[PDB]
Scaffold this active site. Sequence first.
Site, PDB file in Angstrom:
ATOM      1  CB  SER A   8     -23.626 117.965 -31.832  1.00 32.91           C
ATOM      2  OG  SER A   8     -22.852 118.812 -31.201  1.00 32.91           O
TER       3      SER A   8
HETATM    4  C1  LIG Z   1     -24.386 120.438 -30.210  1.00 32.22           C
HETATM    5  O1  LIG Z   1     -25.320 119.964 -31.761  1.00 32.22           O
HETATM    6  C2  LIG Z   1     -24.383 120.788 -29.764  1.00 32.22           C
HETATM    7  C3  LIG Z   1     -25.387 121.150 -28.509  1.00 32.22           C
HETATM    8  C4  LIG Z   1     -25.234 121.900 -27.650  1.00 32.22           C
HETATM    9  C5  LIG Z   1     -25.926 121.613 -25.822  1.00 32.22           C
HETATM   10  C6  LIG Z   1     -26.518 122.701 -25.186  1.00 32.22           C
HETATM   11  C7  LIG Z   1     -27.731 122.305 -24.828  1.00 32.22           C
HETATM   12  C8  LIG Z   1     -29.207 123.779 -24.237  1.00 32.22           C
HETATM   13  C9  LIG Z   1     -28.823 124.112 -23.571  1.00 32.22           C
HETATM   14  C10 LIG Z   1     -29.984 125.772 -23.447  1.00 32.22           C
HETATM   15  C11 LIG Z   1     -29.648 126.589 -22.966  1.00 32.22           C
HETATM   16  C12 LIG Z   1     -31.310 127.368 -23.047  1.00 32.22           C
END
Ligand SMILES: *C(=O)CCCCCCCCCCC
Lengths: 546, 164
Positions: free
Chosen positions: A1
């Site tokens: 990300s």
């Molecule tokens: C990149 O690293 C992706 C990040 C994903 C974000 C998801 C949000 C976390 C939610 C967890 C829910 C229990």
Amino acid sequence: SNAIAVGSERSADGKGMLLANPHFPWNGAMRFYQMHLTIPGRLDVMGASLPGLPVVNIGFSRHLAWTHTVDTSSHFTLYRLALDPKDPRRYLVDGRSLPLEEKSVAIEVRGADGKLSRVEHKVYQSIYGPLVVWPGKLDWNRSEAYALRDANLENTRVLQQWYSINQASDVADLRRRVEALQGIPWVNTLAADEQGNALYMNQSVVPYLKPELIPACAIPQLVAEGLPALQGQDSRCAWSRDPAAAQAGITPAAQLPVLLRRDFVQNSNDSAWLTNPASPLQGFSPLVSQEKPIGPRARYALSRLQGKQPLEAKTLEEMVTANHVFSADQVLPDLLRLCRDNQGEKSLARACAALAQWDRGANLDSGSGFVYFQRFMQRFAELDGAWKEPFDAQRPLDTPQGIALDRPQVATQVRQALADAAAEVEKSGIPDGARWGDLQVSTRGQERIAIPGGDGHFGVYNAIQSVRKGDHLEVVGGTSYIQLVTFPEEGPKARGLLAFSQSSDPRSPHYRDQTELFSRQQWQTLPFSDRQIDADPQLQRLSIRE
Amino acid sequence: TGLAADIRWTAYGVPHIRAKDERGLGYGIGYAYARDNACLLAEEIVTARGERARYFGSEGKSSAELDNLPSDIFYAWLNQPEALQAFWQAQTPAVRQLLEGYAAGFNRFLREADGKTTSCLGQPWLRAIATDDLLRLTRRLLVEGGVGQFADALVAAAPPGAEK
Ligand SMILES: *C(=O)CCCCCCCCCCC
């Protein structure tokens, strides 16, 4: 990300701005879904969320936008147990023999005959949590075993945490709400508000050990390998208790990295360290954040972000849509020199031509030079001391750089690596004049859609992970929900896409509609205001009750 | 009952849910999500309930690419009734209401589904959901940065025999 938050000192309008570019699976239990949630008067928030969750995970509201990236902090610790010399089902704490607990689960299994059989399985547990075995590394023998304590098993606050984020007004309010609850499991949080504050938080659930306990409590050989492992035969190595923590045994919020600035903050899955190089984040627990060399995505972002020039929305969008393979910047100049030095070499001819003609991108029309470069890099990664300038802590943004061609041993091995890469590429069945977009696709029913981008490990900001399936590379994860938010006078302006589209069902009108648009890299308005929603000629409305 | 939502969809099937309370809000979300993704949620719920082998046999895998039986063992362990109960009991009224609405909204779509946007219509695993199922999914996500990455390792953990 990736995540970039821009503040009043660097934004073109003097207000906040946020790019959200999470990299996540294109299927399954973590497939993002767009939605807008409103309880008039007290909740109005839009973004995307994971399956089954009635909250927005990444989004924006009237004065705020936020996103997340997977952090480098530990969210569990392994415990090495010392086993009772008389009984491998018992383990020692302060020299006292304790029994393992045995918990059985029963599973129904559909057989070849179509009938169900009951399978019973024993799960062994210690005071720390369940035992785990990695054959050849974390064994269960007659001397030792390993248990795992997951900090998020006691985090009952996770859903309330996002619901609270959904209600946040600005950056300061967001910070209060997250620090107060400490409900975030395993991500960083980055945000910008209308006022022009840029916020980074490494605020999650992290096992706490008081500083003086770590040297003695760590398993040296395992921590060296990046595994959070502790001495499970000493009761003094239990996670530390601090009354300020929202959960017993986790790190208090005041001890976790936070950076509040008015220029920028960024993260691409490295530690908190170089969120903004002007203000390095240091002196944290090894379980929290370490000063490790950054990856090529962050290095790329910082090369575009550093400086005095104002940042436009367009600038941030193009950092994604350029599909620049930033790892080429460190390696390709010298590789091409090597090529020019070996023009008599028949086995190098096709590779060198393809690399010289390559636009250094992962665009749909990018040449096969990308494929040659990928296979070279996989082999370059395994060579010892091949960097002309190895990583330099004093120069953490500009190193490593170049190939040490002046060293004969390196020159031999790099040329051999290119020879082997070339053979592997040519051993494939990629037709003449094939472009990257001819290879990397997302299947939709009987159809395919060409997908731009490439692996994050090669420094493409638009990270796309794919696997070989038949004649193509099938996209499995990467760029997913895209959100670029600014705050002009009328209300937040959000621009983006959901790369794989709203629906995973082939029967849906929304199975591939945004995927066609992602292929062409044509981002769209994310309508948030009643005016924007009402203006949509596709608008449909249903009221339901029971 | 006491569940009501106003849903607007804009281009690309993006829902905008309006309600007066969390129950209503969840109702809209579950309904809208089901319209686009009923089959995906049903499959992931099977996974989080540790029921993959029951419906699909031991030869398949989950969408996380774990073998069905080891996956089932892990999720049966993770999502034990007492763990779910304690988790629920720690939830604020607002979150309980979000979850209750979601389940009811999802189930409403299921009752009405005629296959228009649902490919798994008639499958035994496509079934009404409970709030416990959403707790199962939540806890699955919760451990993604922890014991979840050691699911195979947990299943593999057994004491030594008589070996040298
Ligand atoms: C990149 O690293 C992706 C990040 C994903 C974000 C998801 C949000 C976390 C939610 C967890 C829910 C229990």
